[PDB]
Amino acid sequence: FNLDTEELTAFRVDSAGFGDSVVQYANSWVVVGAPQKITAANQTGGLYQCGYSTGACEPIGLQVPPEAVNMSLGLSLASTTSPSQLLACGPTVHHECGRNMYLTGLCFLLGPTQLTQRLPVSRQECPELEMAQEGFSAVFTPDGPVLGAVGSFTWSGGAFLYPPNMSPTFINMSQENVDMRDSYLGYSTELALWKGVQSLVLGAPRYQHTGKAVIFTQVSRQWRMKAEVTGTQIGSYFGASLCSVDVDSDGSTDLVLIGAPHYYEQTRGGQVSVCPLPRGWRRWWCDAVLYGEQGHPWGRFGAALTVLGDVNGDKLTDVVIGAPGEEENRGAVYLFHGVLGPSISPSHSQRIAGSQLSSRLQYFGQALSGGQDLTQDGLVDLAVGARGQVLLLRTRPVLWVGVSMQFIPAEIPRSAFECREQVVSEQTLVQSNICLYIDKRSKNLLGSRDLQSSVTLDLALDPGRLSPRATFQETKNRSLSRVRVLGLKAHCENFNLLLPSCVEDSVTPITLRLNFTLVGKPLLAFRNLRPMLAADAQRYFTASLPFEKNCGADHICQDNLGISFSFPGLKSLLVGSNLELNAEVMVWNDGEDSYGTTITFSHPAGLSYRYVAEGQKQGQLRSLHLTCDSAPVGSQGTWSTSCRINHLIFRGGAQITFLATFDVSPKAVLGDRLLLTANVSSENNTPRTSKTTFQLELPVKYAVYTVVSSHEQFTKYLNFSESEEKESHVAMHRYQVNNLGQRDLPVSINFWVPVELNQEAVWMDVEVSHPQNPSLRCSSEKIAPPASDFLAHIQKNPVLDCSIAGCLRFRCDVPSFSVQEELDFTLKGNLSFGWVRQILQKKVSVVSVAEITFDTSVYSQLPGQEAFMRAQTTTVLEKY
Amino acid sequence: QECTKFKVSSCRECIESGPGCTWCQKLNFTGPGDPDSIRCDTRPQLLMRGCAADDIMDPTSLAETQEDHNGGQKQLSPQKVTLYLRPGQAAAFNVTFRRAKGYPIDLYYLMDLSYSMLDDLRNVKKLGGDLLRALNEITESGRIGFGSFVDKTVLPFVNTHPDKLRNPCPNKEKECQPPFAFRHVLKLTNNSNQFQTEVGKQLISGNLDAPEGGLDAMMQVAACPEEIGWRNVTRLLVFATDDGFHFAGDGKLGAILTPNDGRCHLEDNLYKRSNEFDYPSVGQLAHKLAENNIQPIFAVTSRMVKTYEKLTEIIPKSAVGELSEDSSNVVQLIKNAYNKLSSRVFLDHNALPDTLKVTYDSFCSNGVTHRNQPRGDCDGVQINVPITFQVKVTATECIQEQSFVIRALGFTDIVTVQVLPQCECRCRDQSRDRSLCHGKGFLECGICRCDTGYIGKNCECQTQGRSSQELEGSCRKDNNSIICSGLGDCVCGQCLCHTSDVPGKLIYGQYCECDTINCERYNGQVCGGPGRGLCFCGKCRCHPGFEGSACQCERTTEGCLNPRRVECSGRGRCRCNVCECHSGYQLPLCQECPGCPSPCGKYISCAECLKFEKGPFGKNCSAACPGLQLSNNPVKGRTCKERDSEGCWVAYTLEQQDGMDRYLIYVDESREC
Numbered sequence A: 001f002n003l004d005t006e007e008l009t010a011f012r013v014d015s016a017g018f019g020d021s022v023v024q025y026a027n028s029w030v031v032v033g034a035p036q037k038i039t040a041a042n043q044t045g046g047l048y049q050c051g052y053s054t055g056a057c058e059p060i061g062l063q064v065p066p067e068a069v070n071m072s073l074g075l076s077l078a079s080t081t082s083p084s085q086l087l088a089c090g091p092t093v094h095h096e097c098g099r100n101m102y103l104t105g106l107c108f109l110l111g112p113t114q115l116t117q118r119l120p121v122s123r124q125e126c127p128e129l130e131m132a133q134e135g136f137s138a139v140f141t142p143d144g145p146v147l148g149a150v151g152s153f154t155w156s157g158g159a160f161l162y163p164p165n166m167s168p169t170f171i172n173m174s175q176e177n178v179d180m181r182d183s184y185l186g187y188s189t190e191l192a193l194w195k196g197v198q199s200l201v202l203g204a205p206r207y208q209h210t211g212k213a214v215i216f217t218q219v220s221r222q223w224r225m226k227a228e229v230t231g232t233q234i235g236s237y238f239g240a241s242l243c244s245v246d247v248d249s250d251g252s253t254d255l256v257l258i259g260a261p262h263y264y265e266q267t268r269g270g271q272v273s274v275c276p277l278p279r280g281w282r283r284w285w286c287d288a289v290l291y292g293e294q295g296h297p298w299g300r301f302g303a304a305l306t307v308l309g310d311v312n313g314d315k316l317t318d319v320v321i322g323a324p325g326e327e328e329n330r331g332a333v334y335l336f337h338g339v340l341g342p343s344i345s346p347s348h349s350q351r352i353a354g355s356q357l358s359s360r361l362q363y364f365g366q367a368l369s370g371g372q373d374l375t376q377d378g379l380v381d382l383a384v385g386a387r388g389q390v391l392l393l394r395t396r397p398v399l400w401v402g403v404s405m406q407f408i409p410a411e412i413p414r415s416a417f418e419c420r421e422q423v424v425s426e427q428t429l430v431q432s433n434i435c436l437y438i439d440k441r442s443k444n445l446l447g448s449r450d451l452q453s454s455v456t457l458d459l460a461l462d463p464g465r466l467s468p469r470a471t472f473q474e475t476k477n478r479s480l481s482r483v484r485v486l487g488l489k490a491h492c493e494n495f496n497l498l499l500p501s502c503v504e505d506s507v508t509p510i511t512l513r514l515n516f517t518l519v520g521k522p523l524l525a526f527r528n529l530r531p532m533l534a535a536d537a538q539r540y541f542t543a544s545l546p547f548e549k550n551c552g553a554d555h556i557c558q559d560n561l562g563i564s565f566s567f568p569g570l571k572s573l574l575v576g577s578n579l580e581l582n583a584e585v586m587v588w589n590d591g592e593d594s595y596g597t598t599i600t601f602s603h604p605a606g607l608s609y610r611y612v613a614e615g616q617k618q619g620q621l622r623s624l625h626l627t628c629d630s631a632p633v634g635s636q637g638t639w640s641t642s643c644r645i646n647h648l649i650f651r652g653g654a655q656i657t658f659l660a661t662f663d664v665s666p667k668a669v670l671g672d673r674l675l676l677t678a679n680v681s682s683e684n685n686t687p688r689t690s691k692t693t694f695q696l697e698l699p700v701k702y703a704v705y706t707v708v709s710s711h712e713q714f715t716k717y718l719n720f721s722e723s724e725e726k727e728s729h730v731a732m733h734r735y736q737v738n739n740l741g742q743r744d745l746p747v748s749i750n751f752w753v754p755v756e757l758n759q760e761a762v763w764m765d766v767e768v769s770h771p772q773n774p775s776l777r778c779s780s781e782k783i784a785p786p787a788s789d790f791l792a793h794i795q796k797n798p799v800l801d802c803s804i805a806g807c808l809r810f811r812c813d814v815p816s817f818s819v820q821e822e823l824d825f826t827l828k829g830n831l832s833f834g835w836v837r838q839i840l841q842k843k844v845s846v847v848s849v850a851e852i853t854f855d856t857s858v859y860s861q862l863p864g865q866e867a868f869m870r871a872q873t874t875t876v877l878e879k880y
Numbered sequence B: 001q002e003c004t005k006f007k008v009s010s011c012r013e014c015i016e017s018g019p020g021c022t023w024c025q026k027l028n029f030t031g032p033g034d035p036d037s038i039r040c041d042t043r044p045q046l047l048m049r050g051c052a053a054d055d056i057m058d059p060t061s062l063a064e065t066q067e068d069h070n071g072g073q074k075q076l077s078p079q080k081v082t083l084y085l086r087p088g089q090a091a092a093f094n095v096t097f098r099r100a101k102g103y104p105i106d107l108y109y110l111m112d113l114s115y116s117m118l119d120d121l122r123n124v125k126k127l128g129g130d131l132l133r134a135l136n137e138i139t140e141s142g143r144i145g146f147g148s149f150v151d152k153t154v155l156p157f158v159n160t161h162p163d164k165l166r167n168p169c170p171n172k173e174k175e176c177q178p179p180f181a182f183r184h185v186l187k188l189t190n191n192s193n194q195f196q197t198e199v200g201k202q203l204i205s206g207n208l209d210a211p212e213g214g215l216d217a218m219m220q221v222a223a224c225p226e227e228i229g230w231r232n233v234t235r236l237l238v239f240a241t242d243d244g245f246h247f248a249g250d251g252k253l254g255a256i257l258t259p260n261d262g263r264c265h266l267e268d269n270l271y272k273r274s275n276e277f278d279y280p281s282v283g284q285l286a287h288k289l290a291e292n293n294i295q296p297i298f299a300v301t302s303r304m305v306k307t308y309e310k311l312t313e314i315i316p317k318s319a320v321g322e323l324s325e326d327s328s329n330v331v332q333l334i335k336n337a338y339n340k341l342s343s344r345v346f347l348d349h350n351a352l353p354d355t356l357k358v359t360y361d362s363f364c365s366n367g368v369t370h371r372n373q374p375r376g377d378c379d380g381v382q383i384n385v386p387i388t389f390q391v392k393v394t395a396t397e398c399i400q401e402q403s404f405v406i407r408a409l410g411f412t413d414i415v416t417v418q419v420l421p422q423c424e425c426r427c428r429d430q431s432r433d434r435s436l437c438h439g440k441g442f443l444e445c446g447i448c449r450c451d452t453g454y455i456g457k458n459c460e461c462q463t464q465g466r467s468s469q470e471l472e473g474s475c476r477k478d479n480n481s482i483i484c485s486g487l488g489d490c491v492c493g494q495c496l497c498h499t500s501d502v503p504g505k506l507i508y509g510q511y512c513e514c515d516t517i518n519c520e521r522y523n524g525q526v527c528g529g530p531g532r533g534l535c536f537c538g539k540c541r542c543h544p545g546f547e548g549s550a551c552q553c554e555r556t557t558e559g560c561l562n563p564r565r566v567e568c569s570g571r572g573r574c575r576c577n578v579c580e581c582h583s584g585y586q587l588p589l590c591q592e593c594p595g596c597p598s599p600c601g602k603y604i605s606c607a608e609c610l611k612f613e614k615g616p617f618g619k620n621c622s623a624a625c626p627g628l629q630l631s632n633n634p635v636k637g638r639t640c641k642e643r644d645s646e647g648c649w650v651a652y653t654l655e656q657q658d659g660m661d662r663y664l665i666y667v668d669e670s671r672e673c
């Protein structure tokens, strides 16, 4: 919501297909594309570098080989930051092989280094890969660039990876993949970096003529497919645009966008699809719910898009999306924000379209790339290409401010209360002190701008009523305004208020609210231009001033209120389950009537209050309209949510009970215990000494998903050749385990392998290998079962669980079972045939049980109860 | 029934409260010191209070069916529905439709001229004497036209240079015509033999990319009949190609980023614009096409049958016709055309403003008793058997007078449905009783609406200076309640809730207890922002199609449905477009349980009881083996391979499906002893 629509730069270089594709070069420059900038004999186009300093585009020098013809370069672009490089492309090279020519594609890598040319410039001689137009869409990655082919084989598609001067690789979908004929796999390409290895993605607009998107991984000596998702509709063109974006800033790509400009059901606005990046192949959904659009048919929404990053400073990256088909063919662009993890906000905050005194440009927003600070005014910039010209929109600084309000005279002493009519109005003098300070600053950093700003303040008392209960002295009106200078350091000024000796209503405290904004906006240089406020701008902040209620001609007015609350049925409370937290608070009034009685809680950051609004029905119970305001308090961690029983009285020794519910975040940062309190008092504040706070402390645990399966590489080997009692046909029980939780947590995987059986060993020298992982330490202990009559026991069931034969427990501890880690391992041992006769039957089967464990306290499994943490493997020894 | 009080100042502001809100006009209904808002309750409550029945002002929605003489329109009546629609209340008007016959037809043959369409050009080049013959029965003097097409001139769709362009024909080079894309060979004419002979003339051509660019041809056809000509009655087209179809976006390959305009610009019955012009978007036809009353008839290979099948779902009035690669059974296509092309009765409407919502009903002739849904899909009616659509138009607010239309897709019959914002109510005037309201106000159905400066249930009070002792009686809900629940200053018994110049904030009620801001949130928005629902005294009144405490379970729809159209596949209730997959089954639609072990054990006994016949053990089978299906096809997914009852390794995949222990197997015809 902070995209400049006034003081921006505009490059209108008329060079045919100019401003048809653009990218953020090294921060200092922006590169535009003009594929159709005719040069020589039906040959290339040309590129243009443009600087902010001077509003002009300088041509860029290029050694266009005679070989590359009608390649119309610039059509595809891509820039990296790692070291700053750029990639321009002619995806339409024409090489005459006599009977018929084809299309190969030719790219150029530039930068502050050597002007490389990489297909690489082995002019693709004639004869699969004739019309693949490689470089149609490119994107970098720590291990070399990556260009995309379309006409690979049956126009299946793919992408040619280039390493560091090492010979390049390539990824299609094999041939065993019968489908994927004519889908342009690689029409669009994007990276998907992660704490682990990188991940590529290709767009296939026409998989079965609808559109699918496929994601690839490059495991050591594998380079297989991670997952994929078909399109939603035929022709929708699901696969057009793709953008891996970072909801937060942890650096690990969280989710991925998709384009489908030509989609609909009733309105053909367009379609962009949000699709997080779940880990664990063979499962992946572009349906983490939503998908942004607009109410305007034939709009081509999703034509292009780029990560913009943190613009409004709320730690939640924001993205941009083009739609050159909006309005009457006019252009358009949209701005959305992240939320928490995999998600975005359907309701956009801004919609800068071509109606923004764009004198006359038809379709704009065709392409766009942003995230780089190029004008060198601090915050990021955006570049959006349009037919003929390309614009730059800067991000205006969003600071927001916190405020405090207080009335020096806490309440009113009843002095100028009921008053009298011999002699004067001695108009009592109340003081009201307000302060203003700005705190969330991380992006704009110290120094000019982040500090100085002017502001308009507009205080007004008892606004909603046509009976001003007072007036400021400075102006004498029931309200006043003054422009004053803010800073990151508070600014406190107290004002003079005049209460008329005589007044009707005293029960209802007098309100004082402020309307504040950002006036002027001149700050030193014009390197800030316009700052602004955020979305959640509670610019209307109000503070109340109570009165000393007449509790009689005497009796002194004793404020006596107690309080006590509990949690009905609350069992254990782990973070994940038990999201909403039901609190049943009771409260007393063993003293004078409390009128505007307020009830405030203290809690860890990991929760806040949400209105219950229940009706339907219950109980002997809450009936109660109450106003609650959350706010940060303590030095670091805790904070208070106050809740004043808005509109009615709490009289006599009457008690009352209401219900207040606190939502808790699944990632609730809080100690192994969480306490909370309840300050209770009357509207007349707390005139005296010992507070009546009520607190309690609870043990806290945390959700975890821990599962374990029995890998199908398991030895069920029975066969008739049983002449003698040999030893070594070692069996192999492989167990794989992994946690889909969301927290790294130590664990200890236990096992149970039969051996001794009445002195007669079952299988000997059994140990456990731990491949693909460090040499971990495992424990070993023998144990003897209940010793029941095993004769008849296994006669029931040929099984040989550990309850019959002396088993062997393996306690393989684990330092930190990081989430997503599929840490797996197997166990083997030469299996003796001797004990087989001991029981006098055939087709027996020995079983091993494997159960994973973890500290029952602090952690625990979520869904109720999943025994997925206890696999099993049953081998057979049928030998006749 | 239901009626929550919004700010009630008049009888109209009681109407703007909800459907189940009624108003009482009977004077002297207000007690010694009772609120005026008490006059606005539910009809039942009013009678229980004493309010007469004929005093209950209840503006209801109804329909005006101004039927025409005849020939005005044919089988879409009524022809003019002037509805008077009160917000929240639905107005219902029926729609009789009894199709009659076949009108003057007008066909057009869109054939793909490739080297794969050779024996198609031979077995079709001149079989048009049996077309008018197949046209003779139902319709009379129709029309017949032809239009060829291949693919864009420029690459990468087909080699642009060099003289293989002059001679694309592969190997035979039997003088095939130059590579083209759309050549309007024949105009709509009466003759039939002249039509046949003008066709055989031209020979095939050829291109590179496998799929065709037939879509571009589509628009250009029905774009400018100022040069092609078209009948003012019927217009049927027919797509024919043993190849794919390129849509918008693919043009970027040919260095063309100029989108489809919609109008054809030819100079010699032959395109020369498709090169400097991008492909028509997929959705650019169901509009433009259906606007000119034209409807293609898919007829291609069985290889391209289920790809045009998914295309039938989207665009209206379109059939699928699987045929041989010789185009011999091409005339039987139209015996299947009118079959379900004159069967699909459609009943949509012009894109209405967001301030309105329209639905329909359906009573097909053959058994179907449908209710509540858009369109009018009844694929069970043909010649002379009427049908029934119950159109229910509802509004959300007091709309402004406007007008829309409800057409039948593929028909020129426009039904001008007028719409009138019905929300005023109508008793009396200020000639009767200039006395009460002490002269400074008028009377309307009992109560008196005072001037700007006068207030009170009898215009007795003014907004500058009032208050009495026990006038504060009905001014506080109960004896232990603060006056006007604060945020309101009492005057003349009642309260005047204060005003806040804060977005959304608004107090209201007898004792100023309710606001439109303090309810349950959702996605950082009040009651779900202005879109989903709204706020009224704590509870959220979610818009239509939205339920929940705060519109939390936002949609009453079911995105939980897969293509199988069974909710959440195996297990999992469908709550708020989400599935609660039982066991470890995962999202979104509950199919893959990544953790399940993969039980092939206990399945061997039944695997050799179905494919092989090695004795249903425990008992018989088809009883102890409800994996009922054993397709004779290469199904896959859960590649299993265990042993049999005695030694041999029996291989078999195992494709589970939907609910519980339901499966689908193919036991390899093999063993290994």
Ligand SMILES: *[C@@H]1O[C@H](CO)[C@@H](O[C@@H]2O[C@H](CO)[C@@H](O[C@@H]3O[C@H](CO)[C@@H](O)[C@H](O)[C@@H]3O)[C@H](O)[C@H]2NC(C)=O)[C@H](O)[C@H]1NC(C)=O
Residues within 6 Å of the ligand: A152, A153, A154, A156, A172, A173, A174, A175
């Ligand atoms: C990448 O994709 C291709 C196609 O989708 C995979 O299949 C390859 O396709 C061709 C089809 O003609 C196979 O036939 C080859 O013919 C040529 C010349 O006639 C001959 O020189 C080759 O030796 C071969 O017979 C080809 O076998 C096949 N390629 C491979 C490597 O098997 C292809 O497998 C995919 N490439 C990779 C590295 O995964």
Ligand SMILES: *[C@@H]1O[C@H](CO)[C@@H](O[C@@H]2O[C@H](CO)[C@@H](O[C@@H]3O[C@H](CO)[C@@H](O)[C@H](O)[C@@H]3O)[C@H](O)[C@H]2NC(C)=O)[C@H](O)[C@H]1NC(C)=O
Residues within 6 Å of the ligand: A456, A457, A458, A515, A516, A517, B501
């Ligand atoms: C803080 O907010 C107050 C109240 O919202 C601002 O005061 C003035 O408020 C009015 C609306 O109550 C603004 O709209 C005006 O509406 C009238 C029609 O009723 C229209 O004719 C005017 O052109 C105007 O738009 C008004 O703009 C606003 N201030 C004025 C007089 O321009 C107040 O501006 C805010 N306080 C400050 C200065 O920080």
Ligand SMILES: *[C@@H]1O[C@H](CO)[C@@H](O[C@@H]2O[C@H](CO)[C@@H](O[C@@H]3O[C@H](CO)[C@@H](O)[C@H](O)[C@@H]3O)[C@H](O)[C@H]2NC(C)=O)[C@H](O)[C@H]1NC(C)=O
Residues within 6 Å of the ligand: A600, A601, A602, A633, A634, A640, A677, A678, A679, A691, A693
């Ligand atoms: C229980 O009740 C008390 C009173 O409401 C809370 O203790 C502290 O109360 C003071 C006001 O008496 C809070 O305001 C402080 O005011 C000074 C200026 O006089 C200001 O400089 C401080 O910054 C502070 O805002 C104070 O926030 C509050 N606690 C502190 C020391 O931070 C108390 O919050 C209630 N108990 C709990 C923890 O629930």
Ligand SMILES: *[C@@H]1O[C@H](CO)[C@@H](O[C@@H]2O[C@H](CO)[C@@H](O)[C@H](O)[C@H]2NC(C)=O)[C@H](O)[C@H]1NC(C)=O
Residues within 6 Å of the ligand: A040, A041, A042
């Ligand atoms: C590139 O080729 C194009 C045609 O493919 C040339 O455009 C015109 O083409 C027609 C038809 O062959 C010729 O008769 C004209 O002479 C061409 N026009 C002009 C102005 O020359 C085009 O000239 C070629 N471009 C270049 C510079 O080689």
Ligand SMILES: *[C@@H]1O[C@H](CO)[C@@H](O)[C@H](O)[C@H]1NC(C)=O
Residues within 6 Å of the ligand: A475, A477, A478, A479, A480
């Ligand atoms: C004085 O009070 C009036 C009425 O409240 C207000 O309209 C006006 O703006 C005030 N004047 C000044 C100088 O503040």
Ligand SMILES: *[C@@H]1O[C@H](CO)[C@@H](O)[C@H](O)[C@H]1NC(C)=O
Residues within 6 Å of the ligand: B092, B093, B094, B388, B390
């Ligand atoms: C519309 O048709 C239905 C079904 O026959 C009938 O019950 C209903 O009364 C009709 N409505 C009108 C407005 O005539």
Ligand SMILES: [Ca+2]
Residues within 6 Å of the ligand: A245, A246, A247, A248, A249, A250, A251, A252, A253, A254, A255
């Ligand atoms: Ca991320």
Ligand SMILES: [Ca+2]
Residues within 6 Å of the ligand: A309, A310, A311, A312, A313, A314, A315, A316, A317, A318
């Ligand atoms: Ca941000």
Ligand SMILES: [Ca+2]
Residues within 6 Å of the ligand: A372, A373, A374, A375, A376, A377, A378, A379, A380, A381, A394
């Ligand atoms: Ca910048």
Ligand SMILES: [Ca+2]
Residues within 6 Å of the ligand: B116, B117, B118, B119, B120, B242, B325, B326
């Ligand atoms: Ca053929």
